[PDB]
Symmetry: D2
Subunit: 312 residues, 4 copies
């Protein structure tokens, strides 16, 4: 391809995405991770955290819609919402889009990266932060969830795979963490989350996530969607003790979409319910999975993609 | 990211996929294309044509299941199948998987490539090529179905995005070609084919392949699925002049699976039928596409990776 | 090999140098070229023009020492210097290092680039540009020395390999151009210039630049040296109509160094004079080169990276 | 650049050479290193060992000439020669080119790679092996030199940088190793060697080599030359107790070149003596160097290029 500036995105240990930069808007170091924000011609601005794309501007709508709305849509009347992780302000954006929302609290360990999302990714946050109903909190979720005891109707979890042994994002993907999410939910409340890529042909982050969350939640329902941006099939899930969040009654998602006036660009009612219908190979793997990650023994993925587990 | 052998695989003009080569198994230069077959730790053997990967081992089951059986399961008792393209002949193996089938004519320019597939790609063909029902034909499929009056229930067009001005195979991408295909159908007959990546920010290959086909059949149904080893969302479609191929029942597709003892590894009735549920953006992209392609001005793929029309040189 | 930002730097058509970008400092697109200045751990700030690196910080001292002082030290008391090209103005700083010098006219298309150098490349220019002896001229150096009757003792041609058919700067690579240069010399006067990589298996840029110049001066001496940050063997030369610029004494070059209190960091009298000792292969390549380039058929660099002649469009 | 097969050659930690392969002649694993032999269009066949180019076919003549002949030329009458390392059979080739040679013994730890040089690099060895005067020995040099006690007029050392901590090529770049080379030399004998790249702008393999060899040899003279193949300025040296191997008398290298009938393609007499005249920056660094690598404390280069030293 053309010669010039490029970014070597890791993807899998055998497949690297080399992606053209037209211009480096911003790049640096926080006390928690590396960022690069550059100008893709294809997807506009792109944001790497560490060695992995985080979002792209022209496609983020697909990911943010797919992460939020299936959880909000699947709750009858979402009033208080917690967003764990998710610093660009887009999860916020789509959460704020539901009018039954009075409060939306967003937590996220890394200030300067938010400060970066704000200075340089207006396209994302879109004003979000400065909405009255919002409350930025810069802490570690596990810390936040242990100290406060406010409760929520939906929690959205938008965190970063727990990759490699040393990583401390690991103590966020244990069952203890999810009972801890659970501990903070009203009755009728639902959890929503990104759970890692599916490429089940290498590997296993998605199904262990599903299995582990299963140990804290009665009803765990796993859905999927292609983020073009990532060139990758991403796994998400919905969880609840209170009811099966994917028994979708005829006409109802659509009902709510109207009442609520959702400006949507990717999702429609039937597409949304489609995300939930999985190929057989995804079913089988989701079923074969037995690893449950625990505080005692937190799971991580090898840099070969394999699921390991040991103390921290 | 190591050192060692890598492939450099075009994905669009701004994203390139660098793949780690465990060992080249065979490359060379047929009079119709460049090819590299190699061994990766990720997807088993990988196959490249010019700058793109035709197919991967660990995951071609998916692409092929997706391509074929829609079209096949939507036909109530298919007997005569045209497979245009598909050197590998996994396209054949999936087809030869339906009982009903008496004769499947595989038609493909590049028998030297087909030979590689034979010699090196067992994993794909799985004897498909020596089925007493297969007719290997070694010609430009446009010459063939023009040079014959033979009839079919299902065509399956397993071709390849037709890149660049200079290419006799942009002629496989026009409403006169899809008409040729149409003319060569039985009364119940359905086409089903592959129709490009879906990557709405770089280009409109899929929509335009779809627009081209809306022009030569009543009913055009796009479906798509995610092919892991491509790292792409691929776009497919079905077209027929008879029924809407998309308004099936889900009870019936199930019927015909269990019925014809299809071994499936990816598809299920539910999943299959869902592939046909498109998100708002993509339905618009389709309902908004205009460019139809014709022998007169065929469309090719710009090396900026978008749809363009221009007259026939 | 990590992840992070990389440059992709053309070296030939089959070797590419991927350089790790610590931080882009400034890129953009002047009406004459693309440019990227960035920060690497290896060589400090790196500067790219189109697909090649003009210069590196930790090691430009070398390229510049090598370019300039030969030519300068071979002239017994240089006063008036033409510097064609050399945006960075390290070419200036080295020149402005000789006492004898009264006036150095730097002449260079692209003042926007020169501005980058000013704003971002202090390390290079080192005030060179504000020497009461420097005349920044912002024109096509071919227009300039054609549009003037001014005279010089040393010219120094710090241009750039002239790649591709379309380029008004292939006109800076002909015997009519080097004659223009000649015509604009004093009686003792010497040219010295940069003359391409030396990479005898891919191409004959150096020999051909040399052959072109043999045509417009009596005495042509190739010398070369290894520029680390390029990972290339670069080729240079001196030409004069007066003496052989190559038959110096080594006692004398030493004289003139100590004499003019040249701070040197790379060159020494011995080393400098040795750059002029070529191996068998390279002397043949030179004695075997034929292609001369002319306004009539100027030579450009093929994107297969070899010398080609073709008439003026 | 074009799309297709490529090889990612390491070079420096900040600069990688990505080099086009037209065809993979051969590649595999020995019990000691990795090989890849491929078809460059530029340089013809190329041979990687591990992650580093070893030779290229159209340019090897430059490297092999530059490694051998300055040592052989600088000996009055070279009869017995030892070549440590150097498995392609090219050092052999040029050593055999001097007619005063009756025996030439070549040692090299890795059989299968020789077996590979023979099956697939005819261009290199050129018959070499099958010359009567030659004697292939497949051992570790240090082992070979400790067991036998034959002696030699020139030793050529053509080994592979000692790179990274775990590497066992390290015990080959100590002073004890060179006293051990020395221990095996007739009087009037000279050592010749590749000593690593010069890029003194990163780093230091060349000057420590020079300094260490200096501790076993009275006269160590360091010369250099650009191998196009490697895109890199490579450092070599000549050593002797018996006399200054780079006091070059007027007309003498040339004298010997004639008498001996050297078919040379790169070197000439004056070029050969030129290699010995170094830039100031190379002089200064050669002089500032103080690290001497020892059995007790073997030196290696960091993967950042820095010279370290500790026990093994
Ligand atoms: C990168 S995906 C997600 C976002 O969640 C953030 N994040 C990572 N770890 C935590 C944590 N322990 N608590 C809250 N947010 C986190 C990261 O800064 C990023 O902005
Ligand atoms: C590998 S998927 C592809 C197949 O489509 C084949 N193909 C390419 N062009 C044509 C054509 N004009 N007619 C039939 N098959 C073709 C390729 O040769 C390959 O076999
Ligand atoms: C950076 S080394 C190079 C310099 O030569 C300059 N250059 C390129 N073309 C011309 C030309 N036709 N006349 C004068 N200088 C030029 C470039 O603009 C750069 O300043
Ligand atoms: C790669 S540069 C040099 C050659 O010397 C060889 N070599 C490496 N270590 C030793 C050793 N201890 N003794 C002899 N030869 C070696 C390598 O196999 C290679 O062929």
């Amino acid at each position: 391809m053309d010669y010039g500036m490029y970014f070597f995105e890791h993807v899998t240990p055998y497949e690297t995405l080399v992606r053209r930069m037209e211009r480096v808007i911003a790049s640096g170091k926080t006390p928690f991770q590396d960022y690069f924000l550059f100008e893709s011609k294809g997807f506009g601005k792109v944001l790497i955290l560490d060695k992995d794309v985080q979002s792209t501007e022209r496609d983020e709508y697909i990911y943010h819609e797919t992460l939020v709305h299936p959880a909000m849509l699947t709750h009858p009347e979402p009033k208080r919402v917690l967003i764990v992780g998710g610093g660009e302000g887009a999860t916020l954006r789509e959460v704020l889009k539901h009018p039954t929302v009075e409060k939306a609290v967003m937590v996220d360990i890394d200030g300067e990266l938010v400060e970066v999302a704000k200075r340089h990714m207006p396209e994302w946050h879109q004003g979000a932060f400065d909405d009255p109903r919002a409350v930025l909190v810069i802490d570690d979720a596990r810390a936040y969830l242990e100290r406060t005891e406010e409760r929520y109707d939906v929690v959205i979890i938008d965190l970063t795979d727990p990759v490699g042994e040393d990583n401390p994002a690991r103590l966020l993907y244990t069952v203890e963490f999810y009972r801890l999410v659970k501990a903070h939910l009203n009755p009728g409340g639902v959890m929503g989350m990104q759970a890692g890529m599916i490429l089940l042909t290498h590997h296993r982050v998605h199904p262990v996530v599903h299995r582990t969350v299963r140990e804290a939640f009665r009803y765990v329902r796993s859905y999927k969607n292609h983020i073009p941006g990532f060139f990758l099939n991403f796994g998400f899930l919905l969880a609840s003790d209170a009811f099966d969040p994917a028994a979708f009654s005829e006409g109802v998602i659509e009902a709510r979409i109207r009442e609520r006036n959702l400006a949507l660009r990717h999702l429609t009612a039937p597409y949304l319910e489609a995300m939930f219908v999985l190929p057989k190979d995804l079913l089988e793997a989701l079923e074969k999975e037995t690893m449950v990650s625990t505080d005692q023994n937190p799971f991580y993925v090898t840099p070969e993609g394999e699921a390991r587990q040991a103390p921290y």
